């Protein structure tokens, strides 16, 4: 149930001693290493042609945050603040009020994407599937505060990516 790496005594007959001295003077293992590197020279490389080719992802992927709506246009979020209670980085800032039809909706929904650790606890704490962490990972900015998302940017990410977020949640809700 254990084994000894490097517990070999080399043989001391003239055959093995001459083999080791030919290895020493004639560099046999170095030609072995050159041959392994030349063997990789004639392989097709693993390089994909980004951005025209993309790295493979799963529908579980945790990328850019988005707020979803129902199939009537009403937003799913009912301001329950479970996502900001569970948030390990305290990246979510929620303020709410009853709006003009008495619905329980948010007035503030901020996600700091520079505090966010992209762990997806908010999407799995959400009881109505409102906050989701979508498929987009290509959202680098030139400014720090362009990553300080408010409710408008998150609802626009939902409206932007809903055709894909709905299919990822369709492919992955039965594992949840």
């Amino acid at each position: 149930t254990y084994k000894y790496v490097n517990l070999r005594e080399p043989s001391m007959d003239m055959k093995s001693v001459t083999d080791r001295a030919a290895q020493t003077l004639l560099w046999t293992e170095l030609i072995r290493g050159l041959g392994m590197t030349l063997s990789y020279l004639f392989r097709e490389p693993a390089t994909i042609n980004y951005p025209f080719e993309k790295g493979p992802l799963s529908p579980r992927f945790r990328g850019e945050h988005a707020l979803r709506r129902y199939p009537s246009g009403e937003e799913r979020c009912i301001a329950c603040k479970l996502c900001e209670a569970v948030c390990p980085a305290q990246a979510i800032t929620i303020e709410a009020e009853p709006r003009a039809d008495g619905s329980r909706r948010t007035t503030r929904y901020d996600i700091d994407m520079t505090k966010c650790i992209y762990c997806g606890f908010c999407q799995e704490a959400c009881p109505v599937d409102a906050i989701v962490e979508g498929p987009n990972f290509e959202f680098s900015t030139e400014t720090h505060e362009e990553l300080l998302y408010n409710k408008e940017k998150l609802l626009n990410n939902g409206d932007k990516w809903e055709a894909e977020i709905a299919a990822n949640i369709q492919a992955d809700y039965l594992y949840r």
Binding site: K81, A96, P127
Partner: protein
């Protein structure tokens, strides 16, 4: 002294005659779960969440109402006490609505907390629930009566402390509704305190409705200034903004109530 000797989980404790089983457990530092018992309301005994086993007695007793006898060994953690708590909690949660995200009582709900503490962790209820018509008892108390567990803290408060006698139960059975039966507006000077004693989000604060949530609130203990009573209050804030005003308990001033102006 006429103190009798009772036992809570085998531990001896000397109690005044007429002490309920709940108070005998409270003297040794153990809080029995309850929904209708309130230490400033009259004893109703109509939620059955306080059912505790007295040993050598083949029946759980309502600890909120049952006086102790001499030499009872109250078993707060025995098996049939826990089965009583889980069964009563399952009946409380059978027709209760899945409103915990949209409910203001969430995070400060007795039904949530002692569902986590004393009940089972899943449902066997394979039927449809009830839904109750919401009432309009004022511009202060939001009323969502599907969340009501019919504990009658409403009625005992409005009858005994506010002296109103306008809340009540109409109907019979599973259709027993707490309300006023008419379009009547419950506006006392103490009409906000029914938000405090309601253990569920059946009665909530309409100005505090949807705005905050109790785990993110900073509780600053302070004093009322609206009258000369000096009622001890909690100002609860969130991100540097006053969210609501709750009562503090002071036995000599405001026992655990505040007026509607204070609230």
């Amino acid at each position: 002294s006429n103190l009798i000797e009772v036992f809570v989980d085998g531990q001896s404790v000397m109690v005044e005659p007429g002490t309920t089983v709940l108070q005998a457990c409270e003297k040794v530092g153990m809080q029995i779960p309850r929904f209708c018992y309130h230490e400033r309301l009259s004893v109703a005994g109509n939620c059955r969440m306080c059912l505790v086993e007295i040993e050598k007695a083949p029946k759980v007793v309502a600890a909120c109402a049952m006086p102790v006898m001499k030499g009872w060994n109250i078993l707060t953690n025995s098996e049939k006490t826990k089965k009583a708590r889980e069964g009563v909690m399952e009946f409380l949660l059978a027709n209760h609505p899945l409103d915990c995200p949209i409910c203001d009582q969430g995070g400060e709900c007795d039904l949530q907390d002692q569902s986590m503490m004393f009940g089972s962790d899943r449902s066997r209820f394979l039927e449809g629930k009830r839904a109750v018509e919401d009432k309009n008892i004022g511009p202060l108390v939001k009323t969502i009566m599907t969340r009501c567990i019919q504990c009658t803290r409403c009625i005992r408060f409005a009858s005994e402390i506010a002296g109103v006698d306008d809340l009540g139960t109409t109907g019979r059975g599973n259709d027993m509704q707490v309300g006023t039966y008419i379009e009547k507006m419950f506006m006392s000077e103490l009409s906000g305190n029914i938000i405090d004693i309601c253990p569920v989000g059946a009665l909530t604060s309409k100005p505090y409705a949807f705005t905050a949530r109790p785990w993110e609130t900073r509780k600053t203990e302070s004093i009322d200034v609206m009258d000369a009573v000096g009622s001890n209050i909690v100002v609860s804030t969130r991100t540097g903004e006053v969210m609501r005003i709750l009562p503090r308990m002071h036995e000599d001033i405001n026992e655990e109530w505040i007026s509607d102006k204070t609230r």
